[model samples]
Target: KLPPGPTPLPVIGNILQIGIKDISKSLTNLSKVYGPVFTLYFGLKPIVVLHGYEAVKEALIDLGEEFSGRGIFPLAERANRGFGIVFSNGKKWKEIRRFSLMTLRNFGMRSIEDCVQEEARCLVEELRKTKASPCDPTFILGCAPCNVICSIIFHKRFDYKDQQFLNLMEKLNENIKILSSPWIQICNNFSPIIDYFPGTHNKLLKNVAFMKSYILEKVKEHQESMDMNNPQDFIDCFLMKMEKEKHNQPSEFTIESLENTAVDLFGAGTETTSTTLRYALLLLLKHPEVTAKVQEEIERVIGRNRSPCMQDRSHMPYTDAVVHEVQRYIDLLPTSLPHAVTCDIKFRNYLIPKGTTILISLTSVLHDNKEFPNPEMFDPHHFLDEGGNFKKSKYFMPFSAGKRICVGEALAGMELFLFLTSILQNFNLKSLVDPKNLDTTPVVNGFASVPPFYQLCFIPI
Candidate 1:
């Protein structure tokens, strides 16, 4: 039997009991009553919810293989047909994910290092050209991160103002917001009932369709020009692999899989990092004292004469702590993308049957009161010991943990540090709103949380 949960009503199950406005926090509260591991129902479906560091770690780390399965996400499966990296399961996922990690290593981390550094230079120049004018950074920050992935996959970066770049950015932005909306999440919980309904979900599908076609167009271009003799980028490598595995039974690399894999990389790499950068500036604006400290460290370490690089991260502990704090504080994806039991297993005192979708409360771990004192406060000192050195935490898992951990974790970390350091190195952050008036509480979404929207000026230092 599944672990006990709130008495679920028929059809709707526990949906009414668990608040939707911020289901992540609601689940946190529920854990106080039901303990760490418990079962809840979403539209007649049983979902095992894991909360806090202990339960989540037990499931994700100790039982990693059993809990490694990707659970149902209707919208994603519908669009990608469960063929690509993020959504695929079983054999397809294992091979594709392994190949991704191998190719990233084969291409060498230096490739991504150079990729982010160059993009940061371009991004800083764009911010500099603003002439201290007040503007929203949503599009600009998104461009730099997207371009890093662009150069890796397509072997090129777009001019920030290029029409193609602008269009793709808008589509991605729209899709993320829509995916995070309450209705889309509800529909995900009850796909059979709401999948056919006309709503923003339709628009999300259309946007995905657009992005897939866009990727396909690029793959078509890569197919025509790519030299098997010297594969340059991710697409080239994938294309080469496709040719090699063309005759193999049940091959994972195909033209259809290529498009989704490219979209997965593009969306994950672009949105996740850029959103953090945007939120980081928002927080820094709220705490100019912290910004000043970061600048002081930058002055002491790299100076303004050179671009920021990954190597410098070691020499700048304060800056490193600040970057770590940015991710830890945000608790970005509260309830990580769902996972499932690969086989029927007895977990703790209960049996979590095979194929049961589970939600691990990452927010629980990131905000664990025992691990991080005063978890609500956004302070870099949380990551810095009394001596002011960077202190890594076992609970810090903004990229998640275990087998399905983010494919772009390393790339995103490098992007965050370099892009952030370059911008601060070149300019001082200014907020039009009073620092006290700026709200730091996240606009919690079902899929992901984002900082409250606000604009700032990048005054040249």
Candidate 2:
């Protein structure tokens, strides 16, 4: 038997119970009655909602392998065709994810960190160009990580002013916005028929098509000049691997897979991290005191002349706590990219049938009151000890946990820390409105939570 949940209505199941908005909060409330491990029906599909730190940790980390499966939500499976690392399962997912992780490693941590540092320099220079004017940093913040990922995957970086690059950026941003929109969620919850009808769902597919076309074009360019002996970047490495695996006819390495993998890397790498940085700036704007504390610590540890490094993160406890808290507070993907069960297994007195989709509500963990006192408030103290040293909590899982955790975790972490510290080191952030009035809540919430678009003035220090 599955864990207890609200009684379902015919055809629609608990759709009435689970209203379309603020699902993170809705599920958390349901957990109070149903307990942490419970089931909810999204149409006919039974989605097991793991709703707290204990349940999420137990299922994902404690019993990792059984829960390692990826759920191919209809819209994404169609858009990506189960060809990429993000949506694929079984052998395809195993090999590509392993290879992707290895390639990301082979690309080198120090090298990625160096790339981020250089991009941070570029970002600061771009901000400097604004001359303390109120600038909508949404596009610029997105471009920094897009450039970093481009350098990693395509072996090139786009000039921020380049029309071609800006066009790609527009598509990427639209892709994320649509994917996170309520329309896409409705499409995922119901039928593919809805996707074909005129609406945002169709717009989403067009945006995805544009993104895929863009990536395929890049892959085509890489194919023309690929050097197997000296693989320059991720695409080259994947291409070389595809050649080696060619003898093994049923291998997952193919041109289609390559294009999809490139799509996954850039799509995941750009928006999530950029969105987080944008939200971080928003939070800093709303909390000038927190910004001052971060600036103060950065000035103390890694002075303005030299760029901040990962090594310096340890010495600057306040900045480290602030960064960790930013991730915790944002709770970006509240309901993590869904997972599935590997086999029919008994978990916590319930028989979860094989292939049942799982929704580990990450917002539950990040906002669990037991771990973070006053979870709703954005306080750096959630990640700091009484002694003011940075403290890591088991519940702080914005990137999520276990086998299917985000592949770009390390790269994103470095980017966040370095980019944030660099900006604070260089300029003072000023909000057009009073800090108290800024709305910290995500403007759109569903597949992903994004902050309301707002501009900031970066006064040169």
Candidate 3:
């Protein structure tokens, strides 16, 4: 009814045409067919996939509130009343988000920069174990940032062998799979039919329930153990808030919602950041010249004996550039969480209607030719100036932009900077096989078109 797009079939719409592996690239390809502002009909609904730098910037940055709604995880909308950050709206969203940010900050994400130092040290020690042995960086990297969230919320990091931790990880992976699938779109969009059927969406909803239950148990444990006067961690602070606010009015920050936020922090923050690091190592192996350059910078600034710290960033321009390049080149979250219009808005010649779900392609923007000269090449030089100082590019939106930008940006950056530096300074990350054969192509969709899980040899420096 609005913008021009492919005509839809009866029930399935355009969902039938795309394969699981090719879906993200297909959507990118669609931009070519339909133009940057064109629409695609998924049965009855028409979703406008906003492609390219100008289009996405115009819609996301310029239009603002017009693109306020996050396209919720299809199963999650049905599972909960949009209670938490990913699916929430209106007063509940504002209240809970504000509280969450405050609680994370109070617990050391903001005011105390030392949280990064602590978390990064834990991560580097973990990597030290894999020295001169082949290892998958994902597990260690995931645990590091995850534990920081756990430490903030529950005051601890679960052991890798911990049954509860393993179970939660499995369930979260299952949820990620569901969210990336076309079936989710079908079910969430046409809930009347797909909602009732037995499918992957239902399984994912069950997984979320399992994850929520696990977090709830932890929350209870923290409340029972927390010192009242001291108020040790995030969960403790939240419990304190609950006691104070429970009398005024009912809020979404119940024990259940707290569990949801915990799951959100651990699952979202951990996996995405870890996956980025994992891919970075793989990319390094294939690009030995770049690896040598990064290592040279690290050795010159960070030294060989001491563990690398975030403080070294100022002196290690190449190392810093590599980190930025890793995020930009990876282009994680290709079908970035879609945002819906809260109000009617106009951009250029087109009017983006209210309630329309618009795709803000992170891939397109990160790979923009104007902002990045050679978008396809993995070049750290892109983020470096003539004098070899680390340069911040305008198109570096690895953490998204605007009102709903990733809250964990600072913490995540610190974790990455420290973890990577520590690893490079102490051990060389080499692929087990010919690094040339190591797959760079992503597995498709939102879980990150992640390079398939592989091993890297942590040769001691």
Q: Provide the clashing-pair count of each candidate structure.
A: 0, 0, 1
TM-score of each: 0.97, 0.97, 0.90
**lDDT, each prediction:** 0.86, 0.86, 0.73
Model 1 accuracy (lDDT, Cα): 0.86
List residue ranges in candidate 1 displaced over 4 A.
Answer: 108-110
Q: What shift in Å separates residue 326 of candidate 2 from its native position after superposition?
A: 0.8
lDDT of 2 by residue, 166-215 (tens): 77777777767777776666665687566457877777777888889988
Off by over 4 Å in 3: 16-20, 108-113, 181-199, 226-228
Clash count, candidate 1? 0
lDDT (tens digit, per residue) of candidate 1 on 145-237: 999988888888899888998888888878777777888767856878456688988888888899888888899999989778887889999
Poorest 10 consecutive residues by lDDT, candidate 3: 107-116
Question: Any residue pairs clashing in model 1, and if so which?
Answer: none
lDDT by residue for model 3 over 1-461, one digit each (tens)?
A: 46766667777677655434455567777778778877766556667887777887777777666676776534556677366666677566677788878777666344334665666666667676665677766566667667766777677777754676666665665566666666665564476765568888778778767767777878887877766677877778877777888676666677766766667777787777767877888788889899899888888887777666667788888888899999999888876777777766676666767787777788888998888899889999999999888888878998888777887888888778887777777777768888667678765465456566778877776
